[PDB]
């Protein structure tokens, strides 16, 4: 069950490129006369449930693992039985001291870390 | 003029399943259809359109509406076979068919002989 994405482009809000005051976060058009709501030809696509991805491969990174947010060594040890299904992702606000402790622990557990090189240097 | 649509004139079929088969006109159904027949068993007597045949220069005397067997007798009597073949038109067609049948080894041989032929290059000074 390799990972298949029905779509890789994001859904940008209509007229978000024309106007800087209009953000690109998707907003469902409400105008009846608007051609985007009527889904004419050549217009931008809209989020539909048909675009949803496979339940088995949902939330899975391109390497087949699911990102599990980790904030300390207690969170890494949780993935002892799920190292083939989940990858550890250290939070952004975890200091470089705790990041080191997390990374050594994850290495013994056989757990992939998504951002294991952040905020640290190497010295062999 | 040398080719007139006539009773008894030999034609060559160029379209249809009988392409490349000689035949002789036996009757004129209309200006667009002619009744032809050939002595060989592979060519049944049939009505063909004038756009599917080319007209040859051989005219052999037949009675109007002659039957298939009598057409063969006249064809053998007037030796149309080996008379059409004598013309360079049939020799060119036969050579084209033979050349199409050559395989890869035969094509290599032809290149060797034609190189042996070309190296002749003897011209008087």
């Amino acid at each position: 069950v390799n990972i298949i994405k029905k779509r890789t482009k994001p859904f940008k809000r209509h007229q978000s490129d024309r106007f800087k005051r209009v953000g690109e976060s998707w907003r469902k058009p409400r105008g009846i006369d608007s051609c985007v709501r009527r889904r004419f030809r050549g217009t931008i696509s809209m989020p539909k449930i048909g675009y949803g991805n496979n339940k088995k491969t949902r939330y899975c990174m391109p390497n087949g693992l699911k990102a599990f947010l980790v904030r300390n060594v207690s969170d890494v040890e949780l993935l002892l039985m799920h190292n083939k299904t989940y990858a550890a992702e250290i939070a952004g606000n975890v200091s470089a001291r705790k990041r080191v402790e997390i990374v050594e622990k994850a290495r013994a557990l056989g757990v992939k870390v998504t951002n294991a090189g952040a905020k640290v240097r190497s010295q062999e | 003029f040398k080719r007139y649509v006539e009773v008894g004139r030999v034609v060559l079929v160029t379209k249809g399943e009988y392409t490349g088969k000689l035949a002789v006109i036996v009757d004129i159904v209309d200006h667009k259809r002619a009744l032809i027949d050939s002595p060989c068993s592979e060519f049944p007597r049939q009505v063909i359109r004038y756009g599917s045949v080319v007209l040859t220069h051989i005219v052999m005397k037949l009675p109007r509406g002659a039957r298939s067997g009598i057409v063969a007798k006249k064809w053998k009597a007037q030796d149309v076979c080996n008379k059409w073949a004598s013309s360079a038109w049939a020799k060119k067609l036969e050579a084209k068919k033979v050349r199409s049948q050559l395989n890869d080894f035969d094509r290599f041989a032809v290149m060797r002989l034609k190189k042996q032929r070309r190296e002749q290059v003897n011209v008087a000074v």
């Binding site: 039985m81 083939k84 | 199409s100 049948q101 050559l102 395989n103 890869d104 080894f105 290599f108 060797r112």
Partner: protein
């Protein structure tokens, strides 16, 4: 470490059986054949025997310099040139293990892997040349008897202007 630690999604029993490859009727042993790809593209070589899928093929090494090789039957054109006598030469020594690339053993130390002080080369052994010479000796009289065939195998096939492969016959 042995008891499975996960769900162990064991594959279902797949009902697929291995059956012998049905090669073309024109790829008989001994027929002259044109190589289509590889470093020896365009060469004409003699089919010694058929392996399971590939054809154990070689041109006489004294003719076109194509050694005992394997060729996939899809990347070859079986010409209609007169067949060569190949029943004489035994071909039982040509199996997939005979042509298989040497497995990686790599006996080294972590002192010469650094500095690249290994220089590992596996140039073709003498028995391979001996086998090639034996095949050449048993094949050359067969190609010498029939005319215009020795240098035909030396030539390289190519397409010229106006050549239509869908119409040309080989």
């Amino acid at each position: 470490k042995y008891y499975p630690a996960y769900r162990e999604n064991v594959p279902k029993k797949a009902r697929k059986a291995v059956r012998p490859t049905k090669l073309r009727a024109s790829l008989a042993p001994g027929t002259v054949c044109i190589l289509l790809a590889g470093r020896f593209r365009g060469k004409r070589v003699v089919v010694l025997s058929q392996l399971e899928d590939t054809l154990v093929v070689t041109g006489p090494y004294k003719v076109n310099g194509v050694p005992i090789r394997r060729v996939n039957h899809r990347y070859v054109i079986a010409t209609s040139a007169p067949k060569i006598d190949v029943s004489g030469v035994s071909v039982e020594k040509f199996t997939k293990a005979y042509f298989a690339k040497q497995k990686r053993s790599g006996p080294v130390k972590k002192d010469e892997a650094f500095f690249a002080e290994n220089a590992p080369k596996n140039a073709l052994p003498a028995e391979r040349i001996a086998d090639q010479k034996a095949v050449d000796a048993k094949l050359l009289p067969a190609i010498k008897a029939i005319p215009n065939m020795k240098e035909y195998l030396a030539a390289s096939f190519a397409l010229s202007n106006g050549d239509r492969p869908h119409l040309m016959k080989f």
